[PDB]
Design a protein around this ligand. Structure first.
Ligand SMILES: O=C(NCCO)C1=Cc2c(ncnc2Nc2ccc(Oc3cccc4sccc34)c(Cl)c2)NCC1
Length: 297
């Protein structure tokens, strides 16, 4: 009945590798809670500080209950920290926009911006600073529903400089308003269909570029209205950046008339692959299995 489930190593199995990261390696697997006689598709992140402290922070992660934020289902502490969460079968949003560029309309892009802002506003209510918001850390539950993950790992434990607010880079200051800067960069990644920010420019030169007033360029599909939101997220004065509550309102307004705000050739006729069409979905999910959501009822 624990909010943060403590799992035995026998209660889960890593089936295949999904990918690596600075923080750890993520696997596709199965959660088989002892005696409960059910198999639940999970991702398991094995990370590269006393136990009670790891548990304390993880509890806040298991506490999050919002449709736009991944929830930590369980933890296993051995020689390693392993985190267990519901498997998101469509992958991360960065890979998703790169792969489906020719079939992503304005409605989808703006709705994802709303969803991410709603999840971040929830984290702010939870007093949980993300520290690593980026398109790679937003997962696709369905094409019409994305969720934020990988929040607070940075605390629990190579810095992602090109997503960081200038005050984080210069003074290790991390707040919800530095998360707003990272939100700006994440939105830029979506609107460019997954371009790499400041491509070519060495990480060591980023703080000077920002101090000189240089910023990521206007994406070609963006009207000035949308680009101005991004630019406000990157103001030097953190208190002057939009708040997540204001971003929800603004992108929600835009999402009601999406073609006024994003200019996409053939916007009218775009359609995304279903579960049974998706290569990525099929790759992961290929028997007698129960969705975490259905189990968690
Ligand atoms: O390919 C992938 N990533 C590898 C590198 O590319 C994908 C991974 C992928 C996934 N579904 C589900 N979680 C995933 N990752 C992931 C990400 C983070 C995790 O831990 C946390 C850390 C901090 C806060 C919180 S809150 C819930 C979990 C969690 C855990 Cl446990 C898995 N589906 C496929 C996409």
């Amino acid at each position: 009945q624990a909010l943060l489930r403590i799992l035995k190593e026998t209660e889960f199995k890593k089936i295949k590798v999904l990918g690596s990261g600075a923080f750890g390696t993520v696997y596709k697997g199965l959660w088989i809670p002892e005696g409960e006689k059910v198999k639940i598709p999970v991702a398991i992140k094995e990370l590269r500080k006393a136990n009670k402290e790891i548990l304390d922070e993880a509890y806040v992660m298991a506490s999050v209950d919002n449709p736009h934020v991944c929830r930590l289902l369980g933890i296993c502490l051995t020689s390693t920290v392993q985190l267990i969460t519901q498997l998101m079968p469509f992958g991360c949003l960065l890979d998703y926009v790169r792969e489906h560029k020719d079939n992503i309309g304005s409605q989808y892009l703006l709705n994802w911006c709303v969803q991410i802002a709603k999840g971040m506003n929830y984290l702010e209510d939870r007093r949980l600073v993300h520290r690593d918001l980026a398109a790679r850390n937003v997962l696709v539950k369905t094409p019409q529903h994305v969720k934020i993950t990988d929040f607070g790992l940075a605390k629990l434990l190579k810095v992602p400089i090109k997503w960081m607010a200038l005050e984080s880079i210069l003074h290790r200051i991390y707040t919800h308003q530095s998360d707003v800067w990272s939100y700006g960069v994440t939105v830029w990644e979506l609107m460019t269909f997954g371009s790499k920010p400041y491509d070519g420019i060495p990480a060591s030169e980023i703080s000077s570029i920002l101090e000189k007033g240089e910023r990521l360029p206007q994406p070609p599909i963006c009207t000035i209205d949308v680009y101005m939101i991004m630019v406000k997220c990157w103001m030097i004065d953190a208190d002057s950046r939009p708040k997540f509550r204001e971003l929800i309102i603004e992108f929600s307004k835009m999402a009601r008339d999406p073609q006024r705000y994003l200019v996409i050739q053939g916007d009218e006729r775009m359609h995304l692959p279903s579960p049974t069409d998706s290569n990525f979905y099929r790759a992961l999910m290929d028997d007698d299995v129960v969705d975490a959501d259905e189990y968690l009822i």
